[PDB]
């Protein structure tokens, strides 16, 4: 934070930042790809959801762990 | 003793300057901004760690 007021740029000798105009063009070109899944990645996710479904429903409490695991979690991931 | 300092203060009340001051104030706005130096880092780095390590034991 002290280096913020010494200059007007944070990183030093390890990194150069990306300007946003060039950044969004690389984003927008990446927006026109539409990747398609495969069958081996289908196999890896299913039992991994059984990992999530099993250990979420062994607590059922108001503890530090949250209550329920939705199927929308798999919809996101 | 504190009441004494209250006492003669209000009594002399009912029986360098302000307009010089605001001249000295508004002059400093357009030409007096400063810039941080190397000596400004070394004290407050040591000091702010004390502000996190021991003030949390009080407030």
PDB file of C-alpha atoms in Angstrom:
ATOM      1  CA  UNK A   1       0.000   0.000   0.000  1.00  0.00           C
ATOM      2  CA  UNK A   2       2.947   2.326   0.614  1.00  0.00           C
ATOM      3  CA  UNK A   3       4.202   1.635  -2.901  1.00  0.00           C
ATOM      4  CA  UNK A   4       0.833   2.832  -4.242  1.00  0.00           C
ATOM      5  CA  UNK A   5       1.505   6.399  -3.176  1.00  0.00           C
ATOM      6  CA  UNK A   6       5.176   6.293  -4.144  1.00  0.00           C
ATOM      7  CA  UNK A   7       4.280   5.855  -7.819  1.00  0.00           C
ATOM      8  CA  UNK A   8       1.199   5.177  -9.903  1.00  0.00           C
ATOM      9  CA  UNK A   9       1.967   1.517 -10.699  1.00  0.00           C
ATOM     10  CA  UNK A  10       2.224  -1.462  -8.369  1.00  0.00           C
ATOM     11  CA  UNK A  11       4.172  -4.392  -9.931  1.00  0.00           C
ATOM     12  CA  UNK A  12       7.951  -4.408  -9.976  1.00  0.00           C
ATOM     13  CA  UNK A  13      10.299  -6.454 -12.203  1.00  0.00           C
ATOM     14  CA  UNK A  14       8.178  -9.641 -12.164  1.00  0.00           C
ATOM     15  CA  UNK A  15       4.995  -8.769 -14.052  1.00  0.00           C
ATOM     16  CA  UNK A  16       3.555  -6.447 -16.659  1.00  0.00           C
ATOM     17  CA  UNK A  17      -0.177  -5.689 -16.589  1.00  0.00           C
ATOM     18  CA  UNK A  18      -2.593  -6.195 -19.439  1.00  0.00           C
ATOM     19  CA  UNK A  19      -4.315  -3.085 -20.741  1.00  0.00           C
ATOM     20  CA  UNK A  20      -8.101  -3.630 -20.812  1.00  0.00           C
ATOM     21  CA  UNK A  21      -8.752  -2.779 -24.473  1.00  0.00           C
ATOM     22  CA  UNK A  22      -6.365  -5.475 -25.676  1.00  0.00           C
ATOM     23  CA  UNK A  23      -7.664  -7.681 -22.859  1.00  0.00           C
ATOM     24  CA  UNK A  24     -11.338  -7.626 -23.868  1.00  0.00           C
ATOM     25  CA  UNK A  25     -10.525  -8.378 -27.504  1.00  0.00           C
ATOM     26  CA  UNK A  26      -8.846 -11.600 -26.408  1.00  0.00           C
ATOM     27  CA  UNK A  27     -11.932 -12.224 -24.279  1.00  0.00           C
ATOM     28  CA  UNK A  28     -14.368 -11.552 -27.128  1.00  0.00           C
ATOM     29  CA  UNK A  29     -12.440 -13.801 -29.505  1.00  0.00           C
ATOM     30  CA  UNK A  30     -12.586 -16.498 -26.827  1.00  0.00           C
ATOM     31  CA  UNK A  31     -16.367 -15.938 -26.681  1.00  0.00           C
ATOM     32  CA  UNK A  32     -16.725 -17.509 -30.132  1.00  0.00           C
ATOM     33  CA  UNK A  33     -15.375 -21.003 -29.471  1.00  0.00           C
ATOM     34  CA  UNK A  34     -18.101 -23.240 -27.911  1.00  0.00           C
ATOM     35  CA  UNK A  35     -16.035 -26.186 -26.622  1.00  0.00           C
ATOM     36  CA  UNK A  36     -17.681 -29.608 -26.625  1.00  0.00           C
ATOM     37  CA  UNK A  37     -17.199 -32.216 -23.890  1.00  0.00           C
ATOM     38  CA  UNK A  38     -15.961 -35.796 -24.294  1.00  0.00           C
ATOM     39  CA  UNK A  39     -16.808 -39.216 -22.851  1.00  0.00           C
ATOM     40  CA  UNK A  40     -13.846 -39.703 -20.508  1.00  0.00           C
ATOM     41  CA  UNK A  41     -14.656 -36.411 -18.799  1.00  0.00           C
ATOM     42  CA  UNK A  42     -18.230 -37.673 -18.446  1.00  0.00           C
ATOM     43  CA  UNK A  43     -16.907 -40.591 -16.392  1.00  0.00           C
ATOM     44  CA  UNK A  44     -14.762 -38.426 -14.115  1.00  0.00           C
ATOM     45  CA  UNK A  45     -17.552 -36.098 -12.984  1.00  0.00           C
ATOM     46  CA  UNK A  46     -20.240 -38.656 -12.060  1.00  0.00           C
ATOM     47  CA  UNK A  47     -18.429 -40.438  -9.229  1.00  0.00           C
ATOM     48  CA  UNK A  48     -17.029 -37.071  -8.156  1.00  0.00           C
ATOM     49  CA  UNK A  49     -20.610 -35.920  -7.663  1.00  0.00           C
ATOM     50  CA  UNK A  50     -21.203 -39.040  -5.575  1.00  0.00           C
ATOM     51  CA  UNK A  51     -18.255 -37.788  -3.517  1.00  0.00           C
ATOM     52  CA  UNK A  52     -20.133 -34.522  -2.975  1.00  0.00           C
ATOM     53  CA  UNK A  53     -23.581 -36.066  -2.486  1.00  0.00           C
ATOM     54  CA  UNK A  54     -22.418 -38.539   0.164  1.00  0.00           C
ATOM     55  CA  UNK A  55     -20.394 -36.351   2.533  1.00  0.00           C
ATOM     56  CA  UNK A  56     -22.788 -33.390   2.418  1.00  0.00           C
ATOM     57  CA  UNK A  57     -25.668 -35.513   3.726  1.00  0.00           C
ATOM     58  CA  UNK A  58     -23.850 -37.004   6.733  1.00  0.00           C
ATOM     59  CA  UNK A  59     -23.926 -33.838   8.875  1.00  0.00           C
ATOM     60  CA  UNK A  60     -27.510 -32.461   8.515  1.00  0.00           C
ATOM     61  CA  UNK A  61     -26.724 -29.780  11.103  1.00  0.00           C
ATOM     62  CA  UNK A  62     -26.390 -26.051  11.691  1.00  0.00           C
ATOM     63  CA  UNK A  63     -22.617 -26.455  12.199  1.00  0.00           C
ATOM     64  CA  UNK A  64     -19.838 -24.664  10.219  1.00  0.00           C
ATOM     65  CA  UNK A  65     -20.681 -26.898   7.265  1.00  0.00           C
ATOM     66  CA  UNK A  66     -23.686 -25.808   5.225  1.00  0.00           C
ATOM     67  CA  UNK A  67     -26.844 -27.871   5.085  1.00  0.00           C
ATOM     68  CA  UNK A  68     -27.733 -29.240   1.667  1.00  0.00           C
ATOM     69  CA  UNK A  69     -26.055 -29.941  -1.690  1.00  0.00           C
ATOM     70  CA  UNK A  70     -28.172 -29.036  -4.687  1.00  0.00           C
ATOM     71  CA  UNK A  71     -28.154 -30.644  -8.141  1.00  0.00           C
ATOM     72  CA  UNK A  72     -27.596 -27.063  -9.291  1.00  0.00           C
ATOM     73  CA  UNK A  73     -24.064 -27.451  -7.907  1.00  0.00           C
ATOM     74  CA  UNK A  74     -23.452 -30.025 -10.624  1.00  0.00           C
ATOM     75  CA  UNK A  75     -25.205 -27.726 -13.105  1.00  0.00           C
ATOM     76  CA  UNK A  76     -22.638 -25.049 -12.331  1.00  0.00           C
ATOM     77  CA  UNK A  77     -19.493 -27.163 -12.247  1.00  0.00           C
TER      78      UNK A  77
ATOM     79  CA  UNK B   1      -7.767  22.836  39.836  1.00  0.00           C
ATOM     80  CA  UNK B   2      -9.650  22.019  36.635  1.00  0.00           C
ATOM     81  CA  UNK B   3     -12.652  23.924  38.033  1.00  0.00           C
ATOM     82  CA  UNK B   4     -10.300  26.838  38.753  1.00  0.00           C
ATOM     83  CA  UNK B   5      -9.248  26.897  35.099  1.00  0.00           C
ATOM     84  CA  UNK B   6     -12.952  26.912  34.233  1.00  0.00           C
ATOM     85  CA  UNK B   7     -13.562  29.697  36.761  1.00  0.00           C
ATOM     86  CA  UNK B   8     -11.437  32.657  35.632  1.00  0.00           C
ATOM     87  CA  UNK B   9     -11.900  31.676  31.981  1.00  0.00           C
ATOM     88  CA  UNK B  10     -15.644  32.352  31.878  1.00  0.00           C
ATOM     89  CA  UNK B  11     -15.294  35.364  34.175  1.00  0.00           C
ATOM     90  CA  UNK B  12     -12.833  37.164  31.914  1.00  0.00           C
ATOM     91  CA  UNK B  13     -14.942  36.042  28.938  1.00  0.00           C
ATOM     92  CA  UNK B  14     -17.859  38.374  29.579  1.00  0.00           C
ATOM     93  CA  UNK B  15     -15.677  41.474  29.998  1.00  0.00           C
ATOM     94  CA  UNK B  16      -2.597  35.590  15.233  1.00  0.00           C
ATOM     95  CA  UNK B  17      -6.173  36.468  14.349  1.00  0.00           C
ATOM     96  CA  UNK B  18      -9.144  34.818  12.658  1.00  0.00           C
ATOM     97  CA  UNK B  19      -9.128  36.927   9.427  1.00  0.00           C
ATOM     98  CA  UNK B  20      -5.385  36.421   9.081  1.00  0.00           C
ATOM     99  CA  UNK B  21      -5.922  32.674   9.456  1.00  0.00           C
ATOM    100  CA  UNK B  22      -8.103  31.923   6.427  1.00  0.00           C
ATOM    101  CA  UNK B  23      -5.625  33.772   4.214  1.00  0.00           C
ATOM    102  CA  UNK B  24      -2.957  31.368   5.464  1.00  0.00           C
ATOM    103  CA  UNK B  25      -5.318  28.437   4.903  1.00  0.00           C
ATOM    104  CA  UNK B  26      -6.484  28.932   1.321  1.00  0.00           C
ATOM    105  CA  UNK B  27      -2.980  29.822   0.131  1.00  0.00           C
ATOM    106  CA  UNK B  28      -1.744  26.365   1.089  1.00  0.00           C
ATOM    107  CA  UNK B  29      -4.219  24.530  -1.137  1.00  0.00           C
ATOM    108  CA  UNK B  30      -2.919  25.298  -4.608  1.00  0.00           C
ATOM    109  CA  UNK B  31       0.856  25.136  -4.035  1.00  0.00           C
ATOM    110  CA  UNK B  32       1.665  23.036  -0.874  1.00  0.00           C
ATOM    111  CA  UNK B  33       0.905  19.368  -1.745  1.00  0.00           C
ATOM    112  CA  UNK B  34       3.847  17.162  -0.705  1.00  0.00           C
ATOM    113  CA  UNK B  35       5.271  13.828  -1.807  1.00  0.00           C
ATOM    114  CA  UNK B  36       6.244  10.848   0.322  1.00  0.00           C
ATOM    115  CA  UNK B  37       9.914  10.066   0.932  1.00  0.00           C
ATOM    116  CA  UNK B  38      11.887   6.994   1.994  1.00  0.00           C
ATOM    117  CA  UNK B  39      11.983   8.016   5.668  1.00  0.00           C
ATOM    118  CA  UNK B  40       8.171   7.883   5.804  1.00  0.00           C
ATOM    119  CA  UNK B  41       8.114   4.113   5.281  1.00  0.00           C
ATOM    120  CA  UNK B  42      10.446   2.826   7.986  1.00  0.00           C
ATOM    121  CA  UNK B  43       8.627   4.166  11.041  1.00  0.00           C
ATOM    122  CA  UNK B  44       5.044   3.332  10.113  1.00  0.00           C
ATOM    123  CA  UNK B  45       5.880  -0.203   8.970  1.00  0.00           C
ATOM    124  CA  UNK B  46       7.248  -0.943  12.437  1.00  0.00           C
ATOM    125  CA  UNK B  47       4.406   1.034  13.993  1.00  0.00           C
ATOM    126  CA  UNK B  48       1.426  -0.476  12.166  1.00  0.00           C
ATOM    127  CA  UNK B  49       2.444  -4.016  13.129  1.00  0.00           C
ATOM    128  CA  UNK B  50       2.206  -2.898  16.755  1.00  0.00           C
ATOM    129  CA  UNK B  51      -1.250  -1.561  15.876  1.00  0.00           C
ATOM    130  CA  UNK B  52      -2.344  -5.033  14.802  1.00  0.00           C
ATOM    131  CA  UNK B  53      -0.542  -7.148  17.384  1.00  0.00           C
ATOM    132  CA  UNK B  54      -1.357  -5.351  20.647  1.00  0.00           C
ATOM    133  CA  UNK B  55      -4.245  -2.924  20.108  1.00  0.00           C
ATOM    134  CA  UNK B  56      -6.431  -5.963  19.344  1.00  0.00           C
ATOM    135  CA  UNK B  57      -5.571  -7.125  22.880  1.00  0.00           C
ATOM    136  CA  UNK B  58      -7.169  -3.867  24.104  1.00  0.00           C
ATOM    137  CA  UNK B  59      -9.795  -2.632  21.613  1.00  0.00           C
TER     138      UNK B  59
END
